[PDB]
Design a protein around this nucleic acid. Structure first.
Ligand SMILES: NC[C@@H]1O[C@H](O[C@H]2[C@@H](O)[C@H](O[C@@H]3[C@@H](O)[C@H](N)C[C@H](N)[C@H]3O[C@H]3O[C@H](CO)[C@@H](O)[C@H](O)[C@H]3N)O[C@@H]2CO)[C@H](N)[C@@H](O)[C@@H]1O
Ligand SMILES: [Mg+2]
Ligand SMILES: [Mg+2]
Ligand SMILES: [Mg+2]
Ligand SMILES: [Mg+2]
Ligand SMILES: [Mg+2]
Ligand SMILES: [Mg+2]
Length: 150
RNA sequence: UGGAGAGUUUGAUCCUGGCUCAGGGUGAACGCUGGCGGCGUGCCUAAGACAUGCAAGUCGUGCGGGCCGCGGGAUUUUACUCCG
């Protein structure tokens, strides 16, 4: 079992004859702090059920994060829709310098030392999806070598 | 060895997009408050106007004097005059 941080919860609303009718969404990261994180987005008529639903979804949605001493192999920019995330390696003693959303994700993947910047649409959902892709897309000297053989 | 973002357009959503804030800085000023020291710093305006004192002189080993004194001489008549 992993840690489960909740980034964003919000109440949405649909219209119906005589009144508005509310739903709830919840963004949840789950991770072990050792190279596995999962992002999950879950909606439901009550907050509780939505958070729970989200964690579940988050576990069905995990990722290889190739740490290298609390940080990442290289720099990556990822655009997701209009949201862009940059992710930069840092020596130790730096911290995770990042906004609320990518930080929670980087924390639970066991990144300890990383420089970020949100560019673009600063939309939480979309920033989180970009952060995931960004991690998702990390390679290392190892796998790159392996890719380039013949 | 270096990079955090948030609030606000909607019933709700995404995007655009402005506005606003959190940070650092100061020859400061204003309020409330005020114990000590060290080191810095102090007319941003009228390059307005200025009382009063002080702020560039020194050299007699370049030169000749004036003025106020004192001493010694040429003089034993008291006027004149040489030197220091
Ligand atoms: N007298 C007060 C004001 O002086 C002003 O003039 C001032 C300026 O001309 C000059 O002041 C200077 C200033 O220009 C420049 N920025 C340097 C420094 N800041 C000031 O310094 C001046 O005043 C300070 C004390 O205040 C003195 O210690 C300094 O030695 C003197 N030069 O000298 C005057 C003061 O010395 C205005 N004339 C007027 O508003 C009024 O005279
Ligand atoms: Mg784009
Ligand atoms: Mg924008
Ligand atoms: Mg409108
Ligand atoms: Mg509204
Ligand atoms: Mg904005
Ligand atoms: Mg002083």
């Amino acid at each position: 079992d992993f840690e489960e941080k909740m980034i964003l919860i919000r109440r949405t609303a649909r219209m119906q004859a005589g009144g508005r009718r509310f739903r709830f969404g919840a963004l949840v990261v789950v991770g072990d702090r050792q190279g596995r994180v999962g992002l999950g987005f879950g909606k439901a008529p009550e907050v509780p059920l939505a958070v729970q639903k989200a964690g579940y979804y988050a576990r069905r949605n995990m990722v290889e994060v190739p740490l290298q001493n609390g940080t990442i192999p290289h720099e990556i920019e990822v655009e997701f829709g209009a949201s862009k995330i940059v992710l930069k390696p840092a020596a130790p003693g730096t911290g995770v310098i990042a906004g609320a959303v990518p930080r929670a994700i980087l924390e639970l993947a066991g990144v300890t030392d990383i420089l970020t910047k949100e560019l673009g649409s600063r939309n939480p959902i979309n920033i989180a999806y970009a952060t995931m892709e960004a991690l998702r897309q990390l390679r290392t000297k190892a796998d790159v070598e392996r890719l380039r053989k013949g």
